[PDB]
Paper text:
[name] is the primary Ca2+ release channel of the sarcoplasmic reticulum (SR) in skeletal muscle, where SR Ca2+ release plays a crucial role in triggering muscle contractions. Using cryogenic electron microscopy (cryo-EM), previous structural studies revealed the homotetrameric architecture of the 2.3 MDa [name] channels exhibiting a mushroom-like shape that consists of a huge cytosolic shell (head) and a C-terminal pore region (stalk) spanning the SR membrane. While the cytosolic shell is mainly formed by a large α-solenoid network interspersed with globular domains, the transmembrane domain (TMD) possesses a 6-transmembrane-helix architecture (helices S1–S6) typical for cation channels, including a pseudo-voltage sensor domain (pVSD) (S1–S4) and the inner pore (S5–S6). To solve the structure of simvastatin binding sites on [name], we chromatographically purified endogenous [name] channels from mouse skeletal muscle tissues.
In absence of simvastatin and activating ligands, an apo-closed structure of [name] was reconstructed from particles under [name] conditions (N = 129,073 particles) solved globally at ~2.9 Å and locally at ~2.7 Å resolution in the pore region exhibiting the unstable auxiliary transmembrane helix [name] (residues 4,318–4,340 in mouse), which is absent in the other [name] structures described here. Indeed, the [name] helix is frequently not observed in [name] structures presumably due to denaturation of [name] during cell lysis or solubilization using the zwitterionic detergent 3-((3-cholamidopropyl)dimethylammonio)-1-propanesulfonate (CHAPS). Denaturation of [name] may expose potentially artificial hydrophobic interaction sites inside the TMD. Moreover, superposition of Sim-2 with the [name]-containing apo [name] structure revealed steric overlaps of the 2,2-dimethylbutyrate ester group and the lactone group of simvastatin with the N-terminal [name] helix backbone at residues 4,324–4,325 and L4320 near the luminal TMD surface, respectively. Hence, by occupying Sim-2, simvastatin would sterically displace [name] or require an induced fit, altering its binding pose in the presence of [name]. By occupying Sim-2, simvastatin would sterically clash with the auxiliary transmembrane helix [name] that is absent in the [name]-simvastatin structures, as well as in most of the previously reported [name] structures without simvastatin. Plausible mechanisms to explain Sim-2 occupancy could either involve the steric displacement of [name] by simvastatin or an induced fit of its binding pose in the presence of [name] putatively stabilized in the lipid bilayer environment.
Residue numbers in the entry:
A (entry chain E): 2 to 108
B (entry chain A): 1648 to 1876, 1923 to 2047, 2089 to 2398, 2411 to 2566
C (entry chain A): 3634 to 3737, 3752 to 4019
D (entry chain A): 244 to 630
Amino acid sequence: GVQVETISPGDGRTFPKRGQTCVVHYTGMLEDGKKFDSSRDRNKPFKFTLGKQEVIRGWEEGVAQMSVGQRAKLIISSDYAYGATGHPGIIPPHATLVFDVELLKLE
Amino acid sequence: CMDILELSERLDLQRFHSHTLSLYRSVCALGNNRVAHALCSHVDQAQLLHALEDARLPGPLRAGYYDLLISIHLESACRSRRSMLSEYIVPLTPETRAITLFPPGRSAEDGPRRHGLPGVGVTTSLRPPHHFSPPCFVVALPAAGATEAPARLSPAIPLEALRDKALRMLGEAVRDGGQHARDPVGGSVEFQFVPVLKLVSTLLVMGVFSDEDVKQILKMIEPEVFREELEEGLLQMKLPESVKLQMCHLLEYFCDQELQHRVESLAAFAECYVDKMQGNQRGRYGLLMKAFTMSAAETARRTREFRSPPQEQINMLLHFKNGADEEECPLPEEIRQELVNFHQDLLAHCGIQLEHKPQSLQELVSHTVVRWAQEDFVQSPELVRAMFSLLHRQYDGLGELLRALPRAYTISVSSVEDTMSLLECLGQIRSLLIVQMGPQEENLMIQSIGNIMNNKVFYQHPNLMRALGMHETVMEVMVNVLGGGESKEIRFPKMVTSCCRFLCYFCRISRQNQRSMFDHLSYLLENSGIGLGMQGSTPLDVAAASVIDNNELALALQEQDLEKVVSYLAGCGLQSCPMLLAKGYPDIGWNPCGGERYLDFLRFAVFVNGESVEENANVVVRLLIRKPECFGPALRGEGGSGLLAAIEEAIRISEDPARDGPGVPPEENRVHLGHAIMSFYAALIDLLGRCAPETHLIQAGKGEALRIRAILRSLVPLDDLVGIISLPLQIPTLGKDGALVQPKMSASFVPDHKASMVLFLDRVYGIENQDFLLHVLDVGFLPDMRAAASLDTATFSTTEMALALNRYLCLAVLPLITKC
Amino acid sequence: VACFRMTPLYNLPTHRACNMFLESYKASWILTEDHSFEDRMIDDLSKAGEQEEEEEEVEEKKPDPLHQLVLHFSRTALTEKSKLDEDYLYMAYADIMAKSCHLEVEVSFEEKEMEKQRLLYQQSRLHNRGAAEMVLQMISACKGETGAMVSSTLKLGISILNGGNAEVQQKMLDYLKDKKEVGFFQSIQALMQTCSVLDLNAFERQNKAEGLGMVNEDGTVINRQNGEKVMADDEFTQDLFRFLQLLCEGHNNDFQNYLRTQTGNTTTINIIICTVDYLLRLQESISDFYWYYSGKDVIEEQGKRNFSKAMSVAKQVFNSLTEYIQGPCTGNQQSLAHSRLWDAVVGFLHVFAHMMMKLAQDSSQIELLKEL
Amino acid sequence: RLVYYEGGPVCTHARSLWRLEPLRISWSGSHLRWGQPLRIRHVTTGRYLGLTEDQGLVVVDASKAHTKATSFCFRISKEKLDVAPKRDVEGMGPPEIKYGESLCFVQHVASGLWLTYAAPDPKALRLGVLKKKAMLHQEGHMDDALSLTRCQQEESQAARMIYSTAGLYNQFIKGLDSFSGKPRGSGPPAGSALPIEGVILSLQDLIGYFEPPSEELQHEEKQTKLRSLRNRQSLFQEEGMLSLVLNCIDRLNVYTTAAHFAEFAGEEAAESWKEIVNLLYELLASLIRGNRTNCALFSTNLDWLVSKLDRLEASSGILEVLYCVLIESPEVLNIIQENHIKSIISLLDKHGRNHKVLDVLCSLCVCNGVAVRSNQDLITENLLPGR
């Protein structure tokens, strides 16, 4: 894998710590540039806890490097993404995923 | 890209996209929650909610998007709730006690003239909740392989927001319809109303609407009738026929709600009334006991009541509708009067008790349906059917309650959680009726059956289960799978094995359950044509369990069913097993392993509670002799080698590989042909011996009994039985410094084979001469008793052969010696 | 030990007591209640309205609601299909329509004629709206499968044909001759062959079942919940033969001939001979049952009931044959003369002679002797 | 070539229909009389019931159907009273034999033998056959009497049409096999002439024959037409015209285009190749449409159909055939495979955005209210993710 590119700066100090609950908005796109998911479409932040392996390794490793309030683009290789299997009907096999992630707050 | 609104003029793209929406609905149709979750990525919630309000969409696309929303997010939940909505399991709680037929008002003191608003109020009938899962496409994939993970839940969509939006759209549609504009939303009144009404009906049936929401819907339907203490309602807007069909669906929902209210009110009254009756009877019994020998005849004359079953006590106590004296019915007058008043109230609520404005749901529905039929020659057969079904329900108010009560059941509070869990499992099983069986469906079915079996309520409330019709559902699933690919091997043998374990315990649960399953004997016998691939339990096992140890059922058994089983046995005795032939077993010309199952069923049909059923026994004997091929090749007319020779040949086969099996293994080679032949002949002899007449009948000298005994003697010679009983068995022996040389029970001559012959000898020929008794002891019995005794050492004590010998002795041989 | 053992209701758990109360109350109070809504419903559905305000100049006045209902059921019957699916709506509305035609000191001649006119009007409300054609279509559609659908259809047919309604007879005959369908008589023949007779094996099985008595509390257990297994469909057989008789009642020569030979149809079925065949089967069953009871000095209650059922069915069949032949229909007379009717008459004469001589000697069976 | 007594559903098929042909042309439609000689013709095959000295009772070809061998008569009893002869009457004559009522014994006039059933031999009962071979015997049995039942004009016409169509299409297939593998080079087609005109006209007539009833008819008439259509479809399928059409399609499929066909049959014949293949597919669709049995016949060979979807000469016709099969038969849906679904999707990919392909995919998911999860998952996984 995951490579993070800043879009808007955060506070730069408070980073997620293992066991904390991160609240985010995200917009998922295939490497081609086809949208396949967005929490903003459902108008409800996505919450997940680090270390519980609830989200793919790409998120696990990428969101950890973002400060609270930061917006960033995560580019995740297939191996860190769903990989060879591919989330059937959504993600083709061996697909690189590009996400536009804003880390709203920690809790 | 273009604006999707350009599809109003780009017709080819419009057609293709509408059929694409149809395909989206099809790929998630009938409970494919995983595909629904996938589609939530392609048509997201924002798009769906925007299309719902987009007033410029072409009609086809508007309808397609409404249907897509329903299919993705609401269809499965609505269908499960609809399936559960036809049963009334009322928990006896304070909320139930608070339910009354009429609102606690004062319009009329008895049976208040005004009903309450239908669908508004308290309902206590148990309906399992809805379960949804958030649509997220960044979660880690469950590493659990397929056919192991829990079934996916329908993707979630904000229900309160959807509810508000649906009501708002319906209100806007009503106002626009009133205005009569020239650009209807979607292009026509049909495309403006039908989608919104479908959404609202789905949401109602799901039961997510609140009381205020339902009141608003009712006021939209008919402002005057459903007022609470635009003036043009939906029912008077000169609407097309499809919109009329949706209105009929709404009215159907509200009529069902009134029926549910009636049932719940009846149960709530029944609780209090039966409590009062019980208190009355306890007091009466106390007085009766206190009465010190006032008159012994009088004491008996009262106490028979308490000697009778509770159902008849209830009937006697309630048998006072047309009047009765204290002797006929001891209920006090006040207790009687409570029931009389409630009966009056119930009749008034149903409308029995006997305006230009309806002023009630019943009058509204009747007048509306008649007005529609008078106004137009309705062309839609579905609309006609719905209209007249509604009209019939409105006119026959009491009949509807009468036909609905059989599915009403009251439970205690302590059973609510278990009943809810069982309803969840039953909902899963019912949902499996509309999908073609696959591996995941098989696993879900098995898990549901297991949970139902481990559920306490399944055992404590068999009447509830018959009312729910669980046996019918499980049988239907089993038969669907059996018929599917019946010519070839039956897939999902594990599922069919579970199909007994459930149904085929269910027969054992209670005698009424056994009656219910017996009513489908021919169905099970019809579907039991091919089996034995399962190696588990079969519909033939279900059939046997449905009659086992029940004289009343065995006497109701039918000759045509016996003929079906006999014909199957004849086929088994004439043609080799295709499955074994495919596996590579040598062709022997007949099917002992299937013949054995058919003979076992006939045995259970003819022998009940240790006594032969003559009616079935005579029929079975006659059928078997009329189809001699059932007796097997050994007992054939000309080429028959005799039972003893057949058993010896079977033993030689068992000792000879390449003639007992494929010669090339979940049960260690499955079937060994030698053991199969021995088992078939043992089962046949057991069946005949059990068909033998009873000793008391023979002593009475009944001609039929003597004739049947003569026929059985002709079929089986005594010398053959003695020879088989004299045949030697393999005894476990120690060798090679600790090697227990145990015979393979599943592939050799076992004591049960001799036990069958002993049964036949005892019941048909009988031991009556001391010389014969001594001869049998010397040749057949005593050697086996000596072997069993010699196997008493510590090493061989628990061997399979030793235990089999012990059972054989203590169940067949020693009792015979005791008798003689 | 049940005699000493008590099972008071006041010890039963509350929920179980509630379920028992619901079952009882349903059977004793709700079920007994009699509501007569059929006449009101049919009148409401027959009344048309506002035809004057719309002043439809199309002489084909739109069918009124009852007509539309009948047309819908005719549509369902005429739909091409492998079998007739059981339809609770059709059964309910057929029952309502049948009950609409009521057919209810010394009542005066004017009173009798007035009741007759009411019955004619009630039957007109239906057969002026296609009820006769619907009945024939449903009988053809059942394809000879016994069931509630055909039972309701036959009862409706009898209801609209009662009194030998000549108009209904003419409508039915015209429909049959115009459509030239073999399905109707094939279905009738199949049903008549499926009609049952006295079965002594079933009788003996029922006797043994009754002799068995549940040890545990009967009411709490199945309580020998066994229905009549001997001629369980006597009501259906009587309805079928009553329908056939009503077709020919009044010396309707046209039906009397049609029931023997359907000239237009590709294949004909002789319903006269089918009736004779059923009568022969019934006679043989009755003779067997008599031979069973010949030795016994007296006949027990279930035997008497079975005799009464068989004898009512035989009486109905004899009435149907008489209605076939009277007028006289010479064709039917010849057909019966060349049939197995004589053998049935011989067997019936034997049974009559011996049963009379026996039943006379006792007084507890005067009713059975009268029916014989 | 053999005659049996069969009692299954053949009593409603076309291979149990026989035509009675008196030994005279004028007044051959007169009332049939007892003892009148006549031939008995099998309508569908056109063969005449007869007695060959070497094989007994058979059906012989018309060329070998001389009067001595193929003359039979109906008698009211087996008594030997045929001594009295009969004289031809120039008129309808007296009505003697009745449909259904009269019971007739068939007798071979030349030999005098009686039409009867052979004694069922063993192992045939064991197989379970309900068919008893018929034979001519000196004495026969007592229940040899036969009853004559009229068949409706519909079945009569269908049987004659089956006879003629079978002849024509077999001639066509033989013609194609004549030059199956013989390149014409630059000269004669090198084979038998093809009945191109007759085949085209026959195909058009049969398509009109099997045309479904119009949706604008009243309900009762539509139902009667549907029943007639189902009956005629079943008759043709049971006589095997479906297999004949499939064989013709197979022979014509070897050639990828009209020019390739011309390289073996000549330009004149190739001028009709596309028309003939399209007509054949239309006839197949007409034969199977709405008929569950005929549609379910494709379960054994679905690949035969799916593999042809990409053919460019009759794309719409093949797609229509597939649509009918999938709409009517759940058995096919239970055997659909991933390769089949991929081919159907490749139709979308290669032929354009046609909504009938979407309809086919929809029909693959649900049939008669039952869903096929495997098909649903395969369609989703192979169509949606690509976007």
